Amino acid sequence: ARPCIPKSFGYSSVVCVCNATYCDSFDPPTFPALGTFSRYESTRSGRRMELSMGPIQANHTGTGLLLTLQPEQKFQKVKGFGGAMTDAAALNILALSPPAQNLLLKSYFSEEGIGYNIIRVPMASCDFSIRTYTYADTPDDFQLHNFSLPEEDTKLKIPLIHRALQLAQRPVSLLASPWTSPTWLKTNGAVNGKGSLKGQPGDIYHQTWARYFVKFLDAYAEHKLQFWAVTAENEPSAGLLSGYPFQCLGFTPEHQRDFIARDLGPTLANSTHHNVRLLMLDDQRLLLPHWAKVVLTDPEAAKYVHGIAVHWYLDFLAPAKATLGETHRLFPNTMLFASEACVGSKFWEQSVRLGSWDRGMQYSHSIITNLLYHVVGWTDWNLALNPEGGPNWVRNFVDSPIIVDITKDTFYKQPMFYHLGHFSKFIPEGSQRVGLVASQKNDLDAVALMHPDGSAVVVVLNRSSKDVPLTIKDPAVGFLETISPGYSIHTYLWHRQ
């Protein structure tokens, strides 16, 4: 029930200011009767997920673009939306006073916020850490007797995850991903650079690494936290590049295939955590469908892979059809999940641009393209970063939906936050993407889904500067007459009975 406190920092739009005693928020969900729709709108001009309502009439007065809901045409069901609880995000959140911390967590996970239901958790350190470390740095301890969780986990990440679940509107799913293994298991004996596991799949090195996954899950289970899934490795292709700066662990598609088939798969299966899902790839989509073909065409490996995790750098171009589309065609029964997204890597662009509407549009656009190409989930990177895009021990290069200003006990909600929210808040787990036919060529990006209870949700993004007259038809209800303003994003919701 609290509006956004706008503030400009010289970019295309504003950020919403939050501190220890104030943050913009929503009232509990209130669903209108059949014949009425709810519209949430955000615009570059300043509007932030503002709610309005209107009628769905039997008569059609519009003569422009028409989007027709086709509920009978069913597609993928949604797993959820969320972000990463990296060391950096945790450090930034915990730098605020407790009252502010709660307003930030509520913004993300609460019904008063945008209802995140997914949190990606790095297994030990990555570039968004203030130091390098793994859970077993003590050399040659192949039985992992000295495996343990550091302060980053027990004092920062875990307590914040518990608080998020507590505030959570919906059940939250945890996803774990490792960047590097202890250095004594790597060919190059370093946390980064070009290096992979030593030996070959099946040996003591590969068996210890797989055991590490189990140890990680055990440790977190001791802290009353269970995981929905883990990925086989974060960006496995990065560890094949000479001089790679961040923590990594190289795997060729063939190496991952064998590691999963011979080590990871069996090990997780024979553990008490057998129900945890295993996602392969967890890398850029331009590596598809090749990586998919190499791993999934091997029965011994395929039987352990539940889905394919993909990453994407919004600042770059990548054909979705040749990657996501082709991969779904070749393996229609293996879910596609976006495990990491980020923007601002442009060498000429600042890592953090407070109030950038473009970066927001890149987020919602990416989510729509993903949804239109079978993806069941979209996961952001760092939940929060400081004004310089840190802390990062190597270098700051990406933005974050929420920026924390510790010296002022305040945090800013970027347009990215709201563009993400237009989906995360209104698309609960179990929602199913359905048909939405455009009557003619247009400049809008749109997607329709059906909630588990049968109600409809349609997101419309206008990345152009011109207002677009629009009519949305639901065969069972009628016509919804509206207008998609230039540089705006809308989420429409309505009962179908």
Ligand SMILES: *[C@H]1O[C@H](CO)[C@@H](O)[C@H](O)[C@H]1NC(C)=O
């Ligand atoms: C920031 O939040 C409110 C809203 O603008 C502002 O009036 C106040 O000065 C700050 N709140 C506190 C006490 O931190």
